[PDB]
Amino acid sequence: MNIFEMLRIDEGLRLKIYKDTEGYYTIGIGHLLTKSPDLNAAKSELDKAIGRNCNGVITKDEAEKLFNQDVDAAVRGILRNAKLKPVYDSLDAVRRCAAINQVFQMGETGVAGFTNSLRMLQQKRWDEAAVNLAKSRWYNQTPDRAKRVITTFRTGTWDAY
Numbered sequence: 001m002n003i004f005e006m007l008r009i010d011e012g013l014r015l016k017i018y019k020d021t022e023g024y025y026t027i028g029i030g031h032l033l034t035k036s037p038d039l040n041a042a043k044s045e046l047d048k049a050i051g052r053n054c055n056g057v058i059t060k061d062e063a064e065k066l067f068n069q070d071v072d073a074a075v076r077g078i079l080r081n082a083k084l085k086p087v088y089d090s091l092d093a094v095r096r097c098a099a100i101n102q103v104f105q106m107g108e109t110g111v112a113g114f115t116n117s118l119r120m121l122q123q124k125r126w127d128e129a130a131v132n133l134a135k136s137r138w139y140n141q142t143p144d145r146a147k148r149v150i151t152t153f154r155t156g157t158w159d160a161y
C-alpha cells in the first residue's frame, strides 16, 4: 500500500464525467472539474486540464496523469500551509498518507475546521484524535471512507485497506 493505491481505492476510476458524492462534476480518479451545475462548464475545465477537446471522455493514461498531478499538489499544499506542515512533518509515513487522503477529498478549506484534531495528531494522542476526527460533517457524509482514513490515523497501519 501507498498513497496512490489508497486513493485509487477510495476514489475509484471512471473515464467519463460523473458527479462526486457532493454532486459535483468529476472525472478519472476523483479529479474535481468544477462546482458549477453547468455540464458545459465542466467539459471546458476538462478540456483545459487535458489539453484537447475531450467531449467529456478521457483515457486511463490521462486519468492517471491528472491523479499524479492532484496527489502532488495536495501534499505540496500541505507543506505550504503553516498550520498543516508541522503536524504533517510530525507524522510517520503511513499517517502522512491519511493526511494526504483527507486533504485530497476535502481541500485545505475543508481542513480548516480540523484544528483540534490536528493538535491531537501532533500530540500522538491517537485514540482521542480518531474520536475527534469523526465528530465532523466529513465522517457523517462519507462514513465508510472516513472510517478507513481515521483507522489509518489511529493505528499507523494499512489494516483498513
Ligand SMILES: CCc1ccccc1
Pocket (backbone or CB within 6 Å): 078, 084, 085, 087, 088, 098, 099, 100, 102, 103, 111, 114, 118, 121
Ligand atoms: C486534517 C488532515 C491533516 C492531518 C494531518 C496533517 C495535515 C492534514
